[model samples]
Target: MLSPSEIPQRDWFPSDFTFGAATSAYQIEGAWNEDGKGESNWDHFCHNHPERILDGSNSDIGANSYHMYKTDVRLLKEMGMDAYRFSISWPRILPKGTKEGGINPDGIKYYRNLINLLLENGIEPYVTIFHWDVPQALEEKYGGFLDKSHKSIVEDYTYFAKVCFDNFGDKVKNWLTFNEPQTFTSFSYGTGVFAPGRCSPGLDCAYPTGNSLVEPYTAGHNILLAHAEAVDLYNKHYKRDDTRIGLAFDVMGRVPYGTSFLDKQAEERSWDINLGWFLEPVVRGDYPFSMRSLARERLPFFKDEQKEKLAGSYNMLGLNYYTSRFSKNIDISPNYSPVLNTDDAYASQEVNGPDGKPIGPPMGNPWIYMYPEGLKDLLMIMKNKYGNPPIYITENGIGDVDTKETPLPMEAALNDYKRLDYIQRHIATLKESIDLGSNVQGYFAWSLLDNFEWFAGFTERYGIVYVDRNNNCTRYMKESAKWLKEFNTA
Candidate 1:
């Protein structure tokens, strides 16, 4: 119901505008233990806590991309895509999480082969240095993403990024240092839904021995520091003409739930925590003032030298948007205590509007309600508020869920009209934003093929191209992929 009545034309966009698809390492790359690959925190998490996953599955054989990368590129090539965004598995290349532990030539060769293949096929490769697949050894060594001393994860992460730059930088032009730092820190540390799970004493997380109020910030602070250092290193040593670097953010648009001024404040706070939590640090030099005052001592302060590095760290930005919510003011009365770092925002995010209706039509998955206009609203925000940097909608799409007993029938899964509608509407909305001068340059659907979806496991299918688990992960073009093939190549 949210899509355009007709398919959009390639000529409708700028001559240089790009259309492509995206996938992550842990989500799509399956050779968990092959070719001397070290264990990742996701690999460790799934093995240890199967009950936590919705389908009790790991990405052990995810889409079999590691073995069948040629098929992947062939799909992209056949679609006439301009670029493909994929990530490198940190543990795959640095088996011990550090260079001192020795490099895995096989892992290096794997990515080099993929990059070279994409270049040969005229599909530019957009690489993410990290996509939340922390090398398990890092967690065992010093708590993954934690800063124990003056030189710990930041140094090691910088080294890892350099390893990528030195080896693959010559081929990959657009580099995203980290994907969704906010989601990574908050989920991994505060809510404990993701790998290396850690939360407060009462939460039913894998490890309930963490400070929910503090650990998220600790990890977030270090994440920014590592990003700044990586950008600094690239600027000094790796950047060549046309080289660009940035990080991706997971954004959910917020509309005020009420007409009151308090609701407006709530909307602002929601953006602060969701977008400004990471965007502001890179745009300016520190966290949003709302965050600093509310989080206070809980949020760490940056030094001047670090601030200098953080400022202007990117010439490009990637935003992953799926749905939006209504932000209602949550009054800070007496005895209102925070159990999670996110609670400091003093906002209640609601799905329904003030009229008690869902924001938009529900897609197959419960969380991804259809609200394509919200995407345009966010682009305008980027233009008016954040200087309108070159932006790419790196990840966007809907999914169908399957549980232990409810495997999707092949015909029903292949007929993905709702997903096609979602994509068409978003691209139309993206064109509007571009015409409005939002500085958006590209659009990438969330995935090319169905793979393991983090905590959701294989239950959620978010791919345009369907993967059949019963037949060596055989690939079939869904209705959406067929439409994309015609739309892209036209």
Candidate 2:
């Protein structure tokens, strides 16, 4: 397996090397209710409770991509990227999920035109199916994924999948089911930090101490079923060998804090509980041994047939990585383990590198730390485990507070440089991984344009192209956009 220290001379990536960036409709497209677009969980969540958004800004008019996708396409062309991975909002596609017995055609046409524009410019369009913006109608009707309704799940999800294929799949062949269900589950179902936000219902209703496991567990089951149904629909009716389908999962690599075996054990526990929590079911078709037994009541059962359906639902594994944390042994023990949490994942301190190197520091964001080396280590881990499924780095970028109007903030410019350096080092490390035999197929920066970032609201600018919200939704490409264009071409 390739490690972070390995670096070789790479004149530049190959022509077919997939250099792309990603975005979601809800985050960038701001026609929340335009052209008969119905309400999503976000619409209700923001409008009803503005307090939830840290900056008191609603995505109501976001980047205004609803009316300005052509301009967005121009930015993609300028970037000289091989692909553009954007999401299809369910509420936009099926409005009320099953509004008045059918799907939303208007929503379909909007994306159809957008996809056509991209393909015409030789940009492969990667479509992500779900990115946490479920139709409020569906959530209200059947409790979203928490309440088991395979019929509703399949019908609505498959309909969207089939519609996407029938309309744009011929040109846009890369498809993704969901972007980080773990984030959605932990936020919406656990902490109430995101949409349809509800703390674990079972625990909230009865017990107080244990983590609310049932909501996220059941949601996981339903999401997998929905993904399987979509994959089946694609294969039976519209799939080709060239067409790729996968799921994007968020993962944080674990670093043991000390040389002791106990610290190493803690690292294993962290990895098993985090990525392995979802990966085992998706790849191996079973829950991780550590998680299943520890979060007993929170676990979901996989039947023989369901297990088969899920084992290989992915043609590739789209990984969204941010950072890694330190782990140290916690003693409350026997042959036992305590439930994994942020406290354990990140010990009070981190360990020195084998070469006696100090680790990186965190970005301004509380949960996100700057650890480009972790990105490399995570790549090696994926290559080593689970048969090294063909991988795509779906999301990786820093969340900063810069915009077109205020680009000269000393801190912001430095932040952009920091982000650019991070991407360069990570991709350089990824190149070594590919050379050493890891099937690392692609690298998509987190966002194309600065727009809405959930909860943190519009205050955080993660876009290469800055949305001038004050200037009637004009977009100005940040210097990083220019740097990336030149970097990718090199």
Candidate 3:
């Protein structure tokens, strides 16, 4: 049950406040290789290394949204979402990852149908040009983001963005060039849980020959360049009246582990690497001072021209917040050596305090502690520290693990009051942020339906709508979805 304080009234937000749900092409859209769609990095990873996935499940059939997008649209209409933030699969459109190779007409037609349907239902489409599912063809072509001697990365990516603008720019007013470049870079290279897996020399992953310490930053640099190129292209050609574009960041909010100065400094360092790694470069035309000092030559250098293009490339920002942690300082001794790009930040994100207390109440999943105040803190940071750009809470939701041995009962699964409480408190916190003058334009829940969740596969359900995989993948509204409908239309 939603308490009175938990429910956020529609009047609390601006009239144009976008309320919606989000999903990526790889996670929800099945038909992985159908109708001229080329192989994506995700397809290559999951296909070759199925054992790496938690449940050994792949998105080969996924939510079957390729065929059931109409049903998905109907559900969005039912929920009263003002917009739908879904990603365009890169390999789907440019089947060979570059127009010089081939452009698929069927892929274009599919997205057109989806966008047209959303418009028909009064839901504006917020498109993300790339969301981690790189064309495997591209990876094979030039070492992917590493670009070792291959320099056409920006050109090819910008061309794909040009394609999107050419086809869908009239309808899709809001666009995000990339979704969580830091996450994609770190996970794919540093941690190696994601596509085209590569880690440090000693670590066990798909390809450990890659230097995890160096390659993530290399990929990160390539993505930033691509983003700038795309934004430049948009400004030159497609950015019409009211059109907006930016990148979405996977932000893990942090607080000091202790009141001590070291802890406080560690907290700031955590922010520098996690958020500022990408954000500072865009805002200030360089990486954060702390990151520059720590990473040193390991970080990629952007020349003056590239820096000029990077600065203010975004008109808005997308913050994908899920959980918070306490940042404690990590003292690097002479023996300490960085093995990963993330290791540059000399901080440990702990879930407990000095007194061994939880950061906040833990959710159903191992991660994602419920910390609404953390959201408030981040909003204030965006307003006070960073120049307040229009923000979208792009992806925020708690996950519920659906175990194969003991699948959650449909009745119990549908009655997800905890998820309702989690989202309610976040939206309430957002209203508070708005009151304090953060330029937040919208909030989109992480997902609309239970679907394939990266390495965790189908095990983690971060959706409001329950997808009954057994029953022809039928959709059912959980308590969270029901409350969202009420909250939107109240």
Candidate 4:
């Protein structure tokens, strides 16, 4: 039987269905290397190596949102959104790795003004403390999350949060620790795609970096520590007794290639290794034992105190779903290096649409196949695994390149319509998940303004509004904005 949410025509969500957009500091706030902003790992990576990025362009001036955020907030209001999900630039705000080095008041003021502006416009602020950009100081001093020094790094991060909460806790309520642990460690470390780019950078080569797979595990551990510490700090001191704190774990739902038991087993193993490495620690307070047993004793162990800190850390889960992949069983003999690109353990099978090929149409990135149904699968999976925890989608959107025919930022605007459609269909599935007992509470579009897309560079525009390069900054809502407003109204 179809659930009521599944049978919805409109208004299928609860009255408080969150509607908002997401942006990262490196993506939209293009004040790169300006205003005492210390160099971030990404800033150093992009400028130093131009060949890695698909577009060969940098965010040196992507959107100029750093100086023009108020206008962007106005755009959020125009879209009838209820929240704004954005990440803080730790390096940009801190300058120095240690809080004792004097805080950047200008950095504080920028976010303070943004939170105030968002509140004045009746929009909630969903702030993430870290989104992949490691402050260069930390990376240089101790080699980022992979270093055991992350415990101190987290303490310093919480100091900044305390400052924010002291001033704006009454206004801003929700906080996320890290945006996407999987992507940050996966693409950034393994593929050398995102910032802090040290692909195969030797461990002793002036900075400690490691296998991408292991780094996410290390990053996940530190993220939990940072999150728990921040929560304790906020609630003990700054929280008004009702604010919510959580972490956003990005997921791309994977399915078995066929109904074969081998395929199912492989998919399950992959899930445990890929997602559960992070999920188990967050929800159950340690990594999954099954994966650990299979890891040739490579899995790191958490201390008793660390487990205590990780216990009950999140109030809700910030689910960030983007796409899907097909998995098949690995039949290779016991002694072989695993294939990183192909899902040999769970081979991917592409199913084409009328657009010519299988999978969703390519937005701008080729590796990510557009599959909206995966979003629904992911939500249901989260509910089953985590026991129906309250949830909100903190990021989701499509990307497309800048074409000349639709020049003058017009092309970016139209692509925004396609993004809107993507969200609409996914939300329809989300509503179904909610009715079927999933605890989904909100949806935030991937971005508010077109800005820098890591690896893809300044080419893939995912914003609802188009940002111009030459002029002061042009803001135009895509047709999807109109569609969303209309759908929400009736």
Candidate 5:
């Protein structure tokens, strides 16, 4: 076990190992309709069904980052960050979400200015091409990425990626093709908690018109093909000095509920559905055998040429680790029906292990438990099982519930000691993984500012720097942010 108090220093990591913070465009860049930006599915969802959001809040003015990106870069420099991980709003760049609709010059200029400003402040921009904010036009046209007719998503998304590479490839060297396709597909289409929320008919969701058991796989398959196409485009046309591209995956480390064989098998199944569903396709050019056998015809098939392009497609891998869960086995038979695509794993994630105790100390947020060893174990798995690909801890942080309905004082909010401890322990665990030769190249905190936290709305605050919504969105460096500065400086 790593001691949270024994904070690792800058010298503990390799000289080239980068440290930074991350945020997505929709989560932070508010100006939902500003500067020729087309409406995203999020804008449509939040407006049509405000009740779907926990606090009835939207990112219309999220820390106002659209107009305040210069300040964002300044804060990164103050924290001694080496990089800034953010996403480009697809609709912002392409109002109609396709090449035929033409480009948005204002959108292109906005990102160029933002990237130039970050470089001026000595920070590299690690950009994610898509971060779940699909242009509403695309979704309305053919159900967006779930379109199986001609698989138009592959063509549209690849076009969008090429536009990005053609315009910004000169300045941005690090790129993430997509951020958490699993979470995007599953949450958006399966459980219906996210934008364009869709679940099976008669379910309790904003829109109960989607086949949860099947649509997630379809969307995920489209994303995988899009990613392969985008990476191939980058390799063939946009390759520049030191430029690298990959996709970000969200991982909640899974532990078997007990030492029983059933629980052990359940753990492997959970990994296959959660991590291996998207990862194995890129690594070995197909879905895991478990998924193939279980999902059967529901999962899409890849052609030989597609398999060749997907295999070894990435220059790096971005992993977002938050916490862990205990996987308990369940029985699945012909009589069984899945509520969500993930249930096909035939396992349920539990908060407690077999001993009937919580996995670790619970954070204020319900989903996360402060289990540092989960991260270490996950890194070891990546090294030993996943071929030790060059990687980055893209999104790793906890969140707080600070909403307009139930607010906390600025002083109370700034004293985020739990966040500081969580970050420190994870950093120490990263050191352990690096010592074990895990090939991790960077660590980017979940966010730099407290912005809109999707479904949870403004309730979950996951920022190192607190954004004051009451006072022109003034930024306050939290205790965690200041501590990170000292930790990085030393």
Candidate 6:
């Protein structure tokens, strides 16, 4: 609740603590089939079922970043960012999702040029190997990560990782193995709003034949195995003294709904099911005990060798934080028929506290209830409970509404005080976390430019730079981006 003037200044943080912006390939890169790129699951999903998308739109020509990447880098430099975090499209690199299918030289050249451009502009590149755009060929062959009976999905994904390492490892020192596996698995398999949408037989999903109770965990297990294998490959063959690799988790800070013991326990369980679902596996080499006890046989088991590889697999941890929630306890019953994997947590997240007021002000997006203290709390928890690992706030920002009927004029859109305040307060919260001995090392805004926002389409504008989708994908710096320029320079 600090005012903008009370927020910490740049000098308040360590000099080495970097600042940057991020974007994902599928979300921003266009040219879906241009220059020998293969079809991705998102490409397939959007094209085949346009109705699933909010505005009946696809990212076939997103921000046109595939062609305007140099412009993107220039914007980062202009904003005074120390780094630029972006993902390489897996389908673009290996059109068929396998090395045997032969690597696409054009796809490799595209990223090579982009990386070189960033380096040339004195911007560090933080590369993510997978951003949830699984190759459509793999999905058609073995249903992607849900192929529990076969090793094809794992093999293909690892091969994709190695191809990235072999090609870009020398130039790119920071690597993210996967971006938000929990979000990917749960959304794509459980709720079925994301690409390759699938849910239980009777649920409202694009493909209503999947078992929402089971597929998320099954896919999550495969993702973890893939991550471990990829990390092992990098360690054995591509390790460098300065290179760092990790996974970025999407987190909604959780607090107890009330002072009751049940609320406190529910909050802890909420963390276990949300953040710990993926983190515990990497830190301790297994799912949280609560998850194991509840999900039981539905949760897959890891071999001892897999556990050894998974434990301490990262040099850092990337956290994608936005907003907070009050976790209230939910009853668990043997007769309860679970419709979603999140139900296993036996908790419900609320925007309101016991006083019935929201955790904080609401951002334009439906989910983001601005609570900067949540970031500080999550960081402290990471320090006190999770062994104080080096961390990066990889993705953090607020979204504004952009629509056709009630369209935002360019001038009004450029003056985003809400977003400016959002970033400033979060940065201040980060400063507080650091002062309290959190090992956080860097912060990256959620995005550099407004681009396709998955099922929400371009309606949720979460970028510092406004992208004119109707007018040649033009980029204009918003007030938040201007504030960042001064903040970083200060």
Predictions: Cα RMSD each: 1.1, 4.4, 1.2, 4.1, 1.4, 1.2
- Ten consecutive residues with minimal summed lDDT in candidate 2? 338-347
Cα miss at 178, model 3 (Å)?
A: 0.5
Candidates 4 and 5 compared by lDDT, better number: 5
Worst 10 residues of 4 by lDDT: 338-347
Candidates in order, TM-scores: namely: 0.98, 0.89, 0.98, 0.89, 0.98, 0.98
Instruction: Report lDDT (CA) for all predictions.
Output: 0.91, 0.75, 0.89, 0.71, 0.90, 0.90
lDDT over C-alpha atoms for residue 373 of model 5:
95
* Candidate 1 per-residue C-alpha lDDT over 1-490 given as tens digits, one digit per residue, 9 for 90 to 100: 4425555778889878999999999988899999899999999999999988887899999999999999999999998899999999999999999979889999999999999999999998989999999999988998888665636899989999999999998999999999999999999989999988889999978899987899999999999999999999999998988989999999999999989999999999999999999999999999999999999999989999999999999989999999999999998888787889999999988999889899989987769899989899899999999998999999999998766788888798899988988999899888788889899999999989898988898889999999998799999988898889999877
List the candidate 4 regions with Cα displacement exceeding 4 Å: 1-10, 201-210, 339-364, 403-417
lDDT of 4 by residue, 78-184 (tens): 77778899888877778875778667777778888988999998988988878877777877777676666566767777776776676667777888877777677
Q: Worst lDDT window (10 residues) for model 3?
A: 143-152
Candidate 3 lDDT, tens digit per residue, 75-171? 9999999999999999999888987878899999999999999999999999999998888898898877778552578888999999999999888
Residue 489's lDDT within candidate 4 is: 57
In TM-score terms, candidate 2 sits at: 0.89
TM-score of 6: 0.98
lDDT of 5 at 350: 95
Q: How close is candidate 5 to the true structure, as a TM-score?
A: 0.98
Worst lDDT 10-window in candidate 6: 1-10
